[PDB]
Amino acid sequence: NYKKPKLLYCSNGGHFLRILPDGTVDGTRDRSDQHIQLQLSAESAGEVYIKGTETGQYLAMDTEGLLYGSQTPNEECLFLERLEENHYNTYTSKKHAEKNWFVGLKKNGSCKRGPRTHYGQKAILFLPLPVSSD
């Protein structure tokens, strides 16, 4: 299990985080979706980038709290990872950390924008899962 892709499974409705070619970020319940394979890479300890391998885009959060796919890994692409007691993780926008804006998905699969997210919500809980070698 060395350097293989990962999925991020959201507790809220069981959606996998999805980064679409047009830069849309949402969730899908379809675990065989073509746009859910991710590479999580660390910067400093507890800082991560989340890259959609099928498009080459990095997960980013804009100044309004909306998730989008960025072709370039810039300041808006860094997230602070925390490991909750329930074994799911949360991801906080580093650039907007003072606002406590999380990566989040609604039960309908759409992005729950930064200001609509809230600590303790199922919307913000993501479990990293493997993708098989082949």
43, 78, 45: which is closest to 59 by C-alpha? 78
How many structural domains comprise the chain? 1
| 119-121-122 Cα angle (round to 5) | 140
Residue pair 93/85 in contact (Cβ under 8 Å)? The answer is no
Residue pair 49/58 in contact (Cβ under 8 Å)? The answer is yes
Whole-angstrom distance, CA of residue 94 vs CA of residue 76: 8
CA 124 to chain CA centroid, nearest Å: 9
Whole-angstrom distance, CA of residue 46 vs CA of residue 16: 21
Beta-bridge mates of residue 85: none
Known binding-site residue numbers? 12
Which tokens go with 89? 């993780």
Backbone torsions φ then ψ of 70, nearest 5 degrees: -115, 125
Residue 111: C-alpha distances to residues 27, 65, 80, 85 (Å): 7, 10, 18, 24
- Method used to obtain the model: X-ray
133, 130, 127, 96: which is closest to 27 by C-alpha? 127
125, 112, 124: which is closest to 86 by C-alpha? 125
Question: 100 lies in which domain range?
Answer: 1-134
17, 13, 20, 69: which is closest to 38 by C-alpha? 17
Residue 17: C-alpha distances to residues 9, 26, 45, 85, 110 (Å): 7, 6, 23, 21, 10
Whole-angstrom distance, CA of residue 4 vs CA of residue 22: 24
Whole-angstrom distance, CA of residue 37 vs CA of residue 53: 6
Whole-angstrom distance, CA of residue 56 vs CA of residue 19: 9
Whole-angstrom distance, CA of residue 95 vs CA of residue 36: 24
Which tokens go with 57? 């885009």
Resolution in angstroms comes to: 1.4
Known binding-site residue numbers for heparin? 12
In sequence order, what DSSP letters do the residues of 84-124 get, joined into one string? -TTS-EEEEESTTGGGTPBP-B-TTSBB--GGG--TT-GGG
Give the domain CATH number at 77: 2.80.10.50
- The residue with tokens 């300041």 is 75
- Residue 87's identity, in one-letter code, is H
- Residue 68's identity, in one-letter code, is Y
